[PDB]
Write a protein that binds this DNA or RNA. Structure first.
Length: 90
RNA sequence: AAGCGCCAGAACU
RNA sequence: GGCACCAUUGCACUCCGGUGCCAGUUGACGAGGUGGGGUUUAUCGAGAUUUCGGCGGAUGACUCCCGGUUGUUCAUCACAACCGCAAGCUUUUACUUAAAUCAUUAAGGUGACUUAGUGGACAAAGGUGAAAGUGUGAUGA
């Protein structure tokens, strides 16, 4: 079920790679320490974000609080990642 | 310090 | 890389849909070279995705004019080939810091790439001395 990494979608696709990465670190920093925020603007990966929390409890409070939150005019949709990311698994 | 200057076709970002 | 649009609500850990508009980046590595006017596709090699393509410059070549050398003095007009602070032709003889590519590893940038250092090697043309040979007449001191 719950995972170290959280999946964020329904984000504004117009916003560039580096800005959004720094902008999402502005909010998810309070819940706990972040290891790496993966951002891609490709066809299958745009308007999406993977945030790696070192604590699982950090990822849970993040989903509970930032769900539905309006970020760049768009309300956020957050779920747990299907599998563990490559920095925590290995 | 004159195989040197420039950039807009092309290519890459 | 950026802005608009069409399209995408999509679960990944070296990049990763299209069109148009805009911006950025690449875009010659050294040697050598200027009496003047015209003309023109301006010399030499090194390298090897573009050193391609475009445009500008240019000391080249050619030609004529101009001023000169050499043809054993030296004045003058031809004739012959040259030179534009150098200068007949051939056979030889040094000198003339090649740089980039390559490998490498530091700085800067979102990136394409950029700036600099280090390591080692390789030229061609030309010109600059030297050595032996071979090149005019006509008229006058």
């Amino acid at each position: 079920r719950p995972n170290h990494t959280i999946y964020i979608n329904n984000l504004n696709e117009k916003i560039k790679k580096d800005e959004l990465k720094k902008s999402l670190h502005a909010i998810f920093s309070r819940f706990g320490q972040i290891l790496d925020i993966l951002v891609s603007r490709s066809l299958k990966m745009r308007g999406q974000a993977f945030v790696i929390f070192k604590e699982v409890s950090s990822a849970t409070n993040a989903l509970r609080s930032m769900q539905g939150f309006p970020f760049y005019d768009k309300p956020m949709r957050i779920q747990y990642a299907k599998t563990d990311s490559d920095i925590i698994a290995k």
